[PDB]
Structures are given as C-alpha cells and as structure tokens.
Design a protein around this ligand. Structure first.
Ligand code: GZL
Ligand code: ZN
Ligand code: ZN
Ligand code: ZN
Ligand code: ZN
Ligand code: ZN
Ligand code: ZN
Ligand code: ZN
Ligand code: ZN
Ligand code: ZN
Length: 305
C-alpha cells in the first residue's frame, strides 16, 4: 500500500535507453514505489495504449518519454480528466492544451548539439579547404533529434568551411547508424567528420568506417551525444574524437518528483540534467567509477521556475 507509478518507456533502441530503463526500475525499488513499467517498442500507439491502460488501473502518477513531440492531445486530456498527474522524462511534447503535465526532466539538447558543433568548428580553425560533415539523425520527430540538429547547425554556422554535405535518420540504433553510414560512404567521396546524434549510431558508423578499410577517429572523425559505456570506451580507444554526455540516471529524481506531485506539492516546470564533454584523454579518466560520478552529476541538476 504505497505510491503507484506507471512508466511508459519508448523501447530499447540504444544503450542510453537500456541504462535509463535500469535507472527507473532500480530507483523505484529503493524508493518503495509500485512501478507499472511498460515497453512500447519504438511505436507511439503502444505508449498511448499503455497510458490509457494506466488510467483504467487507477495509478497515482503517470510518467513517460514522448517518443515523438506530437499526437498526445487526447491521452493527456484523458489523464487531466482522470486526475492522474503527468511527468515527462528525457523527451518533450508539442501540446495545444493548458497544464497537461507537471514537469519535464531532461537535458538541453540544443546545447548538446551546439557544444558538438562548436568542437568541430574549434578543430577546423586553420582549414584552408572545405570540411565535409555527415549527420546521423535520431528518430524522426523526437525532441532530442530536432534540437540536436538545430544546435549542431548553430555551432557549425560560424565557420564557412564546415558544410553538412549529408544528413539522414538512423532511428537512434546501432544498425540504423551502420546502414546510413555505409549508404553515405557510397554517395559521398570526401567525408571529414560524422556527427552522430546518439553514440549508438556513431558506433554503427564506426563499424561501417572500419568495414570500408578506413581508420575511424583518424581518417574520419566521430563526435556524438550520450557518453554510454560503449561510446565512452570507443572514445578512450581513439575510435571516437569528442563525446557530449546526456545523463540516463533519472530514476531517483523521477521518484522524488512523483511523490511530490502525488501529494499535490508544487514541482518546478523544468528539471534540466547537466552535461559535460570528453576528448579521448578525458574519456580514459572518466570511465572508472562511472555510475557513481553520473549519479553525483544529476544531484547538480537545475530548475527553470
Ligand atoms: O534525452 C535524450 C533521450 O531521450 C534520447 O533517447 C535515446 O534514444 C537517445 O540515445 C537519447 O539521446
Ligand atoms: Zn536492476
Ligand atoms: Zn486538446
Ligand atoms: Zn503556466
Ligand atoms: Zn526541446
Ligand atoms: Zn556496459
Ligand atoms: Zn558527467
Ligand atoms: Zn531539484
Ligand atoms: Zn528550485
Ligand atoms: Zn537552464
């Protein structure tokens, strides 16, 4: 007889996601929250069905990661009508209604993108010729994909030699990143750098660079967002060049907010998780007690009131 939480996950498309799923499950047990976890498997209709199912179960609070910004109108009005508060985690919505969710816990995707773009720009400062950028876009319609594109675009904007000569969705998967990169290796001859919006896509792209007998991290540079275990290991080994952290360990704050919310306590409208970036040497030093350092970084989150 404790707080009942219903979480509707996107799927398990990346390492970041699988880390997030573990953080949400583990944090619920330690907080003593009755979690009703649901895996949509990368399809919005199954997140919608899961949200509708949580109302019929009579849960105290609902939380989910909006796979894509649009198509939640009705489900959020059903929750507002049912009186179940809503918390958005790691992805935002595009809603035409007033007070449909309590707060959004996530990172500043535009700055994750800007920081990545400004690194490419800082590296190719003395370039006397053009520098060819390739871009592996995340799931079409997802809040981080749009924002990271817009951000990266701005970081690049202050250097005319940088040109995104190609850009295409890789669905935030390793397989998806491989396909699009092998397809780019055909269509584009000169590729200086690839900007993966999720290091799983950049890992698939790294396999495709190796498969086409080219040295990733030397011949073609890779810069990605997330800083997963595998992503961070590649950077530490020299296969990647720059990584911008997106912290998956929301579990603990998601519970704290779920309890505050459920008891009618005001919570800030935004909870922005921090970010940092690593070159190769930094990746080496950052790998050791990683999950402790990440949990420490989240306690330094900030609000927008
Ligand atoms: O907040 C970001 C999160 O929603 C994104 O989802 C994951 O697909 C991807 O790796 C990650 O960047
Ligand atoms: Zn576990
Ligand atoms: Zn409406
Ligand atoms: Zn308001
Ligand atoms: Zn956004
Ligand atoms: Zn691992
Ligand atoms: Zn960190
Ligand atoms: Zn706080
Ligand atoms: Zn505050
Ligand atoms: Zn801020």
């Amino acid at each position: 007889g404790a707080l009942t939480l219903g979480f509707a996950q996107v799927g398990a498309e990346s390492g970041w996601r699988t880390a997030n799923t573990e953080s949400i499950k583990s944090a619920a047990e330690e907080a003593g929250v009755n979690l009703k976890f649901a895996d949509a498997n990368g399809e919005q209709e199954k997140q919608i069905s899961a949200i509708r199912s949580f109302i019929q179960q009579g849960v105290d609070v609902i939380a989910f990661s909006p796979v894509v910004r649009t198509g939640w109108d009705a489900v959020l009005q059903e929750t507002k009508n049912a009186g179940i508060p809503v918390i958005l985690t790691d992805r935002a919505v595009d809603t035409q209604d007033t007070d449909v969710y309590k707060t959004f816990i996530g990172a500043d995707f535009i700055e994750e993108g800007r920081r990545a773009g400004q690194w490419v720009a800082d590296q190719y400062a003395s370039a006397t010729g053009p520098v060819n950028i390739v871009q592996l876009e995340g799931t079409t319609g997802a809040d981080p994909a749009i924002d990271r594109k817009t951000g990266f675009a701005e970081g690049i904007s202050k250097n005319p030699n940088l040109k995104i000569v190609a850009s295409q969705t890789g669905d935030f998967t390793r397989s998806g990143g491989k396909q699009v990169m092998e397809a780019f290796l055909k269509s584009t001859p000169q590729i200086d750098v690839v900007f993966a919006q999720n290091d799983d896509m950049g890992l698939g792209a790294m396999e495709a660079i190796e498969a086409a007998g080219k040295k990733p991290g030397t011949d073609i540079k890779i810069v990605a967002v997330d800083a997963t275990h595998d992503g961070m290991q590649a950077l530490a080994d020299g296969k990647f060049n720059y990584i911008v952290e997106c912290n998956p360990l929301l579990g603990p704050e998601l519970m704290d907010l779920a309890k505050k919310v459920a008891a009618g306590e005001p919570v800030p409208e935004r909870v922005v998780t921090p970010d940092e970036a690593f070159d190769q040497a930094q990746a080496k030093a950052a790998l050791p007690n990683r999950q402790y350092k990440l949990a420490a970084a989240l306690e330094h989150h900030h609000h927008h009131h």
